[PDB]
Design a protein around this ligand. Structure first.
Ligand SMILES: [Fe+3]
Ligand SMILES: [Fe+3]
Lengths: 399, 409
């Protein structure tokens, strides 16, 4: 059926980043019409209508990078964290970790999975899911190459209207060149998305550029292989593999302006994803947001996983995103809201993240105790938003 | 009355920043002895003893700068600029202070449950003083002064309110005095406040160069403060009350002054504070800098000048939670320093550095110091090399809190 909802502040989440006051929207499975809440209640008098005063009505968030496979690990260094994850060499937390996204207002997630453990629970959840099956392998092996293209077939046999199948190549230090050319080709063949970790550390930059640094000893101590040279001969050699695709580039805190200009000019449809908290614990260098826009790209904000973070609430990761950059606060607060909405749905190629006609009815309502001023609404929301009062996904009431 | 407590990790919070494993402490009102927990249970067999596995035992925190009169403020004020925030605070005209004691009692619980045992509260009308007395917290009340025009009538209405403050002092509450800012207090109204602190032998706290608008005003009599005294203060002043940054600093020469914020003080300004205030204490509040000025304190400049920092929550006029732990994590995200070194500066800025600035006998697990101890329980046993930082990320609530050797939480 059809129903009307309106709040004292409505965040359209357009590229203009428009906030409207006392507006309402009518929706079924999709968003049909927008306008003033009172004028809408006269136009459609018989539709059920609810208004929320001193509340914010916005799109449901999109978390494009989150691993549900997970103290333990070491923070303060990337080498120390990777060493501590490999010195290590789940079903119940997964059913409660989805609940941490719904209550935070997240309606769509781009989850990276290695063994397809959480995909079954993501299907009964109301969440919009884009599972990237991640490929890990620094030695060529035709045997595992077909054991990975057979696990993807199990993913494509589980697709719905809520779960889309995608594929991921881990990092330039973990995947051999001819094993990624096959993964990338299968994504073109299956017409699915690509996610990848790119220049996340200073040690990976030293490794990819000049075959030096902490990675001389990585393949010997941890992988039982005898390799002492980089799998790729420079940063551009890794990028050109993703030419003419829809590739999600995560982190990129150590990619130079020439490197991101190359990503934009060559990948054609590249989407940079950033996770503020995980960069602090690991590499320690935050993403230069000016360099991002000096190259012509935009960022989405993601929680990453509890592999290198303390809370997977997208709102708490937004505040840490605000504290991590010296940009003018009120402009950067718009980069966060759009990086958690429209920019995250365009990276995942979904039909939500914006209050627009014919878009998915993925709506969040957040209740407060005051009415923020229109000039401050976007920033006051990010500081005080913690839980969600109402969450509508596909026009169905979930929370 | 003596008892024994030990944890898997013990943070001494000395300047060595020593982490010890399976250590214990014996305490009454003060800390008696430190050592290995098992050796302590044989030395003092009859003392009641509790051990906490996968826990951290450390001093109770010290929050040296927090306004409790403004705890009824969720939104209201404007963030993104200091001029925008001060304008919105003075456009409020002190209307958010009314009906506050119930919110004040809910901000006190945010310090105890976060592990804070001693706090340096800034007060203008002494509304929360009795609630701090009805509280287990160690209190250092700073009586704040606001007045940009000389008026000896208000000078004795302020020196009579201080006598009412010293008439409520005990061993739990110490009385201090505060000068607001170089933009809010006339020179001869602060020299009287400062002199009364010398007379009463009390501590001085002050907000110093917190904004870019405050620096241009103090240095060149320009910026957003040319029009400030007319719009909001109903006064006719168009030049700075002090003739340079050093003119405000030299008033605090030879005393015990807490300098808050100071994100816009240059190395020359910070070298002068140490050499001239003689016993100066820099206070920093990471989150309030982000919402207001937007510029974080240069911690490298702090150590290039020879000073150290303590971390304080400020008030909720410009903050979202007074859990000192949330402010420590925000302190970690706000500076680009090597994380593992900066995590010790955070722990010490919430402990030893805050108790010497507040002139208290705690903030360190040392013999003859106050038995102000906090116990935080976790699910893993951290490596000693990671313990200090892993504590800051996962600490949320406190398992046990002992203040003066008495069990509080
Ligand atoms: Fe990842
Ligand atoms: Fe303050």
């Amino acid at each position: 059926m059809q129903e009307i909802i309106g709040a004292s502040l409505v965040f359209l989440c357009n590229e203009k980043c428009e906030v409207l006051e006392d507006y309402g929207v009518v929706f079924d499975e999709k968003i049909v019409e927008i306008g003033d809440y009172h004028n809408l209640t006269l136009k459609y008098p018989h539709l059920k209508a609810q208004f929320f005063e001193n509340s914010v009505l916005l799109p449901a968030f999109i978390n494009a990078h989150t691993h549900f496979e997970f103290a333990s690990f070491d923070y303060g260094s990337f080498s120390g964290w990777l060493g501590s994850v490999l010195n290590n060499g789940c079903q119940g937390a997964i059913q409660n970790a989805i609940m941490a996204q719904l209550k935070s207002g997240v309606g769509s997630v781009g989850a990276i999975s290695n063994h397809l453990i959480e995909v079954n629970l993501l299907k009964e959840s109301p969440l919009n899911a884009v599972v990237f099956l991640e490929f890990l392998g620094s030695s060529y092996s035709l045997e595992k190459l077909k054991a990975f293209e057979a696990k993807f077939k199990e993913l494509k046999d589980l697709e719905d209207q809520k779960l889309k199948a995608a594929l991921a190549v881990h990092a330039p230090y973990s995947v051999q060149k001819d094993m990624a050319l096959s993964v990338i080709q299968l994504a073109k063949d299956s017409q699915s998305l690509l996610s990848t970790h790119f220049l996340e550390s200073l040690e990976e930059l030293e490794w990819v550029e000049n075959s030096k640094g902490w990675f001389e000893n990585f393949y010997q101590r941890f992988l039982k292989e005898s390799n002492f040279t980089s799998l790729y001969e420079g940063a551009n050699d890794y990028i050109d593999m993703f030419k003419d695709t829809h590739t999600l580039f995560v982190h990129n805190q150590f990619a130079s302006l020439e490197a991101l200009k190359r990503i934009k000019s060559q990948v054609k449809n590249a989407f940079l994803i950033t996770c503020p908290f995980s960069n602090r614990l690991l590499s320690g260098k935050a993403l230069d947001l000016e360099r991002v826009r000096e190259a012509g790209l935009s960022v989405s904000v993601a929680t990453d996983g509890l592999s290198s973070n303390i809370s997977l609430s997208l709102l708490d990761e937004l505040r840490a995103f605000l504290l991590s950059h010296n940009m003018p606060l009120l402009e950067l607060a718009k980069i966060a809201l759009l990086g958690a909405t429209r920019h995250g749905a365009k990276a995942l190629a979904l039909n939500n993240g914006e209050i627009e006609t014919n878009k998915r009815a993925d709506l969040s309502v957040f209740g407060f105790n005051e009415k923020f001023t229109k000039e401050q609404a976007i920033l006051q929301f990010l500081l005080h938003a913690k839980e969600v009062e109402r969450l509508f996904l596909g026009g169905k009431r979930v929370i």
